[PDB]
Design a protein around this nucleic acid. Sequence first.
RNA 1: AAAGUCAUGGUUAAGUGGGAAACGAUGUGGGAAGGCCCAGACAGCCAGGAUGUUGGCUUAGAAGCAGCCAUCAUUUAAAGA
Lengths: 94, 130, 135, 38, 136
Amino acid sequence: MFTINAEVRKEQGKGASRRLRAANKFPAIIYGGKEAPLAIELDHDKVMNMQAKAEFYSEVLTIVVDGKEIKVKAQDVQRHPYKPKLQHIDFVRA
Amino acid sequence: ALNLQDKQAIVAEVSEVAKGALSAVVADSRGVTVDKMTELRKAGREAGVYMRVVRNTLLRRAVEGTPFECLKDAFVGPTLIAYSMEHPGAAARLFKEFAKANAKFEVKAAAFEGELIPASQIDRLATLPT
Amino acid sequence: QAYVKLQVAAGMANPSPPVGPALGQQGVNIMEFCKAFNAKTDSIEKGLPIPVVITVYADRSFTFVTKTPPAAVLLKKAAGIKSGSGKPNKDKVGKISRAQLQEIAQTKAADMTGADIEAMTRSIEGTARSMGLVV
Amino acid sequence: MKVRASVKKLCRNCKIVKRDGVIRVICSAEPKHKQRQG
Amino acid sequence: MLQPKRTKFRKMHKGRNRGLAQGTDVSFGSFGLKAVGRGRLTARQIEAARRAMTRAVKRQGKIWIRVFPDKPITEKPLAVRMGKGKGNVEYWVALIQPGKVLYEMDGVPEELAREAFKLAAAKLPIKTTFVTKTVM
RNA sequence: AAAGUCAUGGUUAAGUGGGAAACGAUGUGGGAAGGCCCAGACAGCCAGGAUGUUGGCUUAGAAGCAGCCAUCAUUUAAAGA
Ligand SMILES: [Mg+2]
Ligand SMILES: [Mg+2]
Ligand SMILES: [Mg+2]
Ligand SMILES: [Mg+2]
Ligand SMILES: [Mg+2]
Ligand SMILES: [Mg+2]
Ligand SMILES: [Mg+2]
Ligand SMILES: [Zn+2]
């Protein structure tokens, strides 16, 4: 059972996303169901060890944000073009 | 190899130790292939592939199972003397094959303690009950 | 003490063109290299290569313990082949059947090294497969 | 001696050493594997 | 040497080579040779790096070449002045951006494909890195 | 040659700073897992590297070592035709 921490993004856009990935982070979003989309930001080195498992893209993950277990699945991922890093992850609510 | 499968290789000592009563010892200053074959080619004409010629005489491995079973062996952790637990026997006839191979091209690393199964002395009691 | 095995089959007694200087190194005269080679060679069936152990005692004498011929020649009578394996995977020579090895497995269970005949059975499987002749 | 911009362990008994600011490959089994970076 | 069988036009402008690459995932095989550098690969460079990885795996496996040279390059000869036309087509290139998987392979152990994409990276003028197939 | 031999916390030992690439290298600082261990590791020292076996040919003799092939398998601590 993967558990991932997350804070809610204050600022959004092109320059703010560049400014997170410098500081060992990357933005994500959770979308699905009756509830609005939730734009969160993740820690880069914690997820990059989890993502190297083939069990990551098949199980129902749990993101903890503002004290709330949200059970989502990995829908899409943007990888860096030549560095082994992560740019952005989509999550669809389970 | 990781420690959990080593933790059944402490269990693998026990049931060999539990069944075995008589044990003879050796060391290797000049460990030859054939100097261990002298006791195993001799073993096949008597019994099976039951026996281990491997060593467990390390400062935690045969030390922990010693208050468990056969408590005299908690002193021979160091000083380079190993264990080979033959499963049957009661003062059997399988002693000097590690020891007579010392005279035949080996330079005496063992000093042949004898394991004291009737709690005997260090002298070889070559009487063998037929 | 140099107990290595070097001769050809029975038809060449005192075999100076096959042996040469090989067993002729020591101070032992050749009259017990040729005629005391016949204590096992003419003692059985001729023509087949018996290896013989020479350990040179200090009194110019020797004794030995006999054994079976190699995995070529006792299997060569069970093959009949003359050239061994001429490029097997690019064109085949033949094969060795498994069940024919039983007669030799009950033959060589006297001196050949070990007590488990069944463990010697898969020993002559892959050894027969080693000869270009897939068992 | 070999003098090369690329020096390497060529066999199993080659040791890479740095003496006075130069990477050298000194060997003990083979005299042909001795090297000096240049 | 790879080359188009036909072109609509014989010549082309020079252009620029900015941007990131598109064929970034390993699509077909299991392992890749991704481009970290920028530049252009001529057809003699693409094909010398193919003979070096084909020989290294001993005709056992399957190789993909993800890039094709289709930009013709002109040159003017020696002792020719600057006007009087555009030069004659001399060779063919492929324009490479950072993030381009160049070659692919499967059907080999991963340790054999480390060492064949090393003997073939030697013949290329851009800096490369070894990638594998990812799940999503 | 006018104005900080300024404070604080780091890095560099190359006069790098104060010219140059593919490539090479136990140079040195930092970081999350990387990755083997008190069922004694890692490095040295006490030691084998057997057995069938020399696996057979074409060759100059072909035996692990000229190349060509199978490269299994026993006595099984382990020893790879
Ligand atoms: Mg901007
Ligand atoms: Mg000097
Ligand atoms: Mg343009
Ligand atoms: Mg483009
Ligand atoms: Mg002044
Ligand atoms: Mg100061
Ligand atoms: Mg060590
Ligand atoms: Zn060397």
